[PDB]
């Protein structure tokens, strides 16, 4: 397998992707430590994972996937680590470089937590969890409208502190694009001070019905 914890991702959409959105997609395959875009390689980012195994899973499931009409090329970087280097401001004001090592949104921080991740191939159906208890289809439609991403074609809430369920799109492409935008959205919490960090992953369910 991979001899480095660092990935190179080519074919990203420069006008839509930032460090958080790269995290939103790659956190499904391992712990993301660093994300770094380079002004010399437009549409490309280095993604440092916790180890080689995370790099293996990420390339196996995301290489040659389409996002915003572009075919992503996910491959092993020749670099052993991401150095902070000459960072720059992206069009949305965020930094080209971001350290996610202390993120509470990383899902592989212990073997126990890592095992709870169902490593699967991208689909047109997303599994959601950590949504507000009383979440509706319309709340997801409003958030998708606000983010300027495609609304899911169907929303299924599972029977149950938080709610979980399924979000379906017409294609794998729509779900992967929405994943990058919607993963970790701060959903309104009427019963407490902290918003609900909506969490997404791929599902093997054929429909949200």
From Swiss-Prot:
Keyword Iron set for record: no
GO BP field: mRNA processing; negative regulation of DNA-templated transcription; regulation of alternative mRNA splicing, via spliceosome
Covalent cross-link Glycyl lysine isopeptide (Lys-Gly) (interchain with G-Cter in SUMO2), where: 188
Modified residues (Phosphoserine): 4, 164
Entry domain remark: RRM domain 2 has moderate RNA-binding affinity. RRM domains 3 and 4 may facilitate RNA looping when binding to two appropriately separated binding sites within the same target pre-mRNA.
Subunit description: Identified in a IGF2BP1-dependent mRNP granule complex containing untranslated mRNAs. Interacts with HNRNPLL. Interacts with APEX1; the interaction is DNA-dependent. Component of a complex with SETD2. Interacts with ELAVL1. Part of a transcription inhibitory ribonucleoprotein complex composed at least of the circular RNA circZNF827, ZNF827 and HNRNPK. Interacts with CHD8 in an RNA-dependent manner.
UniProt name for this protein: Heterogeneous nuclear ribonucleoprotein L
Organism: Mus musculus (Mouse)
Residues of the full protein shown: 376 to 586 of 586
């Amino acid at each position: 397998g991979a001899d480095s914890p660092v990935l190179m991702v080519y074919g990203l959409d420069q006008s839509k992707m930032n460090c958080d959105r790269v995290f939103n997609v790659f956190c499904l395959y391992g712990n993301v430590e660093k994300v770094k875009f380079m002004k010399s390689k437009p549409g490309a980012a280095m993604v440092e994972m916790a180890d080689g195994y995370a790099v293996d899973r990420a390339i196996t499931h995301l290489n040659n996937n389409f996002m915003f009409g572009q075919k992503m090329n996910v491959c092993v970087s020749k670099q052993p680590a991401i150095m902070p280097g000459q960072s720059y401001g992206l069009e949305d004001g965020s930094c080209s470089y971001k350290d996610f090592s202390e993120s509470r949104n990383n899902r592989f921080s212990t073997p126990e937590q890592a095992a709870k991740n169902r490593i699967q191939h991208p689909s047109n159906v997303l599994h959601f969890f950590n949504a507000p208890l009383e979440v509706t289809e319309e709340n997801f439609f409003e958030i998708c409208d606000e983010l300027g991403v495609k609304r899911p074609t169907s929303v299924k809430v599972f029977s149950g502190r938080s709610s979980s369920g399924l979000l379906e799109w017409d294609s794998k492409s729509d779900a992967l694009e929405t994943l990058g935008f919607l993963n970790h959205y701060q959903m309104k919490n009427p019963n407490g001070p902290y918003p609900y960090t909506l969490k997404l992953c791929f599902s093997t369910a054929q429909h949200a019905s």
